[PDB]
Amino acid sequence: LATDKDKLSYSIGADLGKNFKNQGIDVNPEAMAKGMQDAMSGAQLALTEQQMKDVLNKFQKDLMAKRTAEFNKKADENKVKGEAFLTENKNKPGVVVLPSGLQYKVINSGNGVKPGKSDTVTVEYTGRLIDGTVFDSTEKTGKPATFQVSQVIPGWTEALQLMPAGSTWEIYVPSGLAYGPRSVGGPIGPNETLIFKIHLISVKK
Ligand SMILES: [Zn+2]
């Protein structure tokens, strides 16, 4: 690895190898080097245009199926844990279960007004997963957040309309009232039940 050409080639290969290994793709680097050399020298490829196209389409299809099965398995695993968590939590002191499946516990009751669907609210909050992983919070920005009541996840919309201004609640949000069966790879996987501590500061008609 003395030249910049060798170092670049190696770095690309290592990036590829790490990506393949991370996806469980069993690959033969020598056979791949040979096909790469053949393509670049202008030689006759050891496979026809069609054999290769068939090979790579079978490859993609298997990958999607594998990725889909991992999604569904994770979606089901999170649903199961969520239902387990909520079934245990409904028994605990102070926990109220609402018709939509949203649960909450009043930590402190305010005396202000309850926001309506159209109002805007200012709130402090922390959102966490069932394992305690915090995925968001106003306590980094050290500044209240502001939201229209109708433009947040349904669990918040249902909770806020019950909350007097000044109140602090913990709410326990079934995935159907949060982000449902979705994963953009972010901190929230599919069918995740969420827990929020929400302090409602003010309501704005
Ligand atoms: Zn409702």
Topology:
Elements: H1 4-22, H2 29-41, H3 49-89, E1 95-97, E2 103-108, E3 120-128, E4 134-137, H4 138-141, E5 145-148, H5 154-160, E6 168-173, E7 194-204
Antiparallel strand pairs: 1-2, 2-6, 3-4, 3-5, 3-7, 6-7
The protein binds zinc ion (ZN).
Zinc ion (ZN) binds next to loops.
PDB class: structural protein
Keywords: Macrophage, potentiator, soluble, protein., structural protein
Assembly: monomeric
If you had to describe this structure to a student in words, what would you say it looks like?
There is one protein chain. The protein is of the alpha+beta class. It has two domains: 1-100, no CATH class; 101-205, no CATH class. It is 41% helix and 21% strand. The protein has helices spanning 4-22, 29-41, 49-89, 138-141, 154-160, and strands spanning 95-97, 103-108, 120-128, 134-137, 145-148, 168-173, 194-204. Strands 1, 2, 3, 4, 5, 6 and 7 form a seven-stranded antiparallel sheet that branches. It is elongated. The N and C termini lie far apart (68 Å). Bound molecules: zinc ion. Residues 100, 158 line the site of zinc ion.
Number of strands: 7
- Rg over C-alpha atoms, rounded to the nearest angstrom: 26 Å
Count of distinct structural domains: 2
What ligands does this structure carry? zinc ion
Q: What are the secondary-structure elements, in order, as H or E?
A: HHHEEEEHEHEE
Specify the helix fraction band: 40-55%
Largest sheet, in brief, is:
7 strands, antiparallel
End-to-end gap: 68 Å
